[PDB]
Amino acid sequence: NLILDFPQPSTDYLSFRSHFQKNFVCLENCSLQERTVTGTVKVKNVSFEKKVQIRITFDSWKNYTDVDCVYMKNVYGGTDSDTFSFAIDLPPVIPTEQKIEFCISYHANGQVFWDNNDGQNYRIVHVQW
Ligand SMILES: OC[C@H]1O[C@@H]2O[C@H]3[C@H](O)[C@@H](O)[C@@H](O[C@H]4[C@H](O)[C@@H](O)[C@@H](O[C@H]5[C@H](O)[C@@H](O)[C@@H](O[C@H]6[C@H](O)[C@@H](O)[C@@H](O[C@H]7[C@H](O)[C@@H](O)[C@@H](O[C@H]8[C@H](O)[C@@H](O)[C@@H](O[C@H]1[C@H](O)[C@H]2O)O[C@@H]8CO)O[C@@H]7CO)O[C@@H]6CO)O[C@@H]5CO)O[C@@H]4CO)O[C@@H]3CO
Numbered sequence: 651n652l653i654l655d656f657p658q659p660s661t662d663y664l665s666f667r668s669h670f671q672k673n674f675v676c677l678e679n680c681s682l683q684e685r686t687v688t689g690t691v692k693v694k695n696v697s698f699e700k701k702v703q704i705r706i707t708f709d710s711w712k713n714y715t716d717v718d719c720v721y722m723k724n725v726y727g728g729t730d731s732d733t734f735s736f737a738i739d740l741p742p743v744i745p746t747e748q749k750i751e752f753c754i755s756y757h758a759n760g761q762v763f764w765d766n767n768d769g770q771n772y773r774i775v776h777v778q779w
Pocket residue numbers: 695697698699700701721732
């Protein structure tokens with residue numbers, strides 16, 4: 651009934667790297683299971699202290715929620731970037747007319763960086779299936 655309306659950003663490496671180098675934050679993977687959306691976010695390692703959040707709407711941006719992401723230790727990651735994970739429960743019912751979208755914010759060293767997917771956000775759409 652719901653599906654991701656975007657390719658996994660990490661699949662197209664050249665696009666992923668271009669966005670990540672420009673914005674210093676980029677969604678890496680995302681999956682929709684049951685009524686929960688989970689995923690991973692790559693951020694440039696700008697400073698020790700970081701705050702990474704998903705800003706998500708389930709009602710066409712009438713409202714939104716900021717959800718904290720959690721740092722993921724990665725033995726195989728480099729020292730230039732860090733990985734954060736998120737898990738967000740969907741509301742029990744979302745009417746078909748309502749848009750579901752999210753974007754990502756990243757605070758470090760007094761600055762804020764955004765992944766808004768080239769101004770479209772990351773969309774989840776309603777389907778017949
Ligand atoms: O321990 C040395 C450290 O002490 C002081 O730091 C204090 C700090 O100022 C307070 O803010 C508080 O910190 C808490 C913090 O506010 C919370 O947000 C949370 O921290 C989380 C981070 O926000 C989050 O980003 C993630 O952290 C991981 C990093 O993302 C990842 O990159 C890696 O971190 C490495 C750093 O990137 C790298 O720079 C290097 O860090 C050194 C610092 O650069 C250097 O300044 C100093 O740090 C001092 C600091 O200046 C003091 O203010 O030494 C660091 C090396 O020891 O190395 C890092 C890897 O070791 O990994 C981290 C995760 O380890 O997740 C964390 C949540 O775990 O919690 C913080 C409290 O735990 O208190 C601190 C502690 O005194």
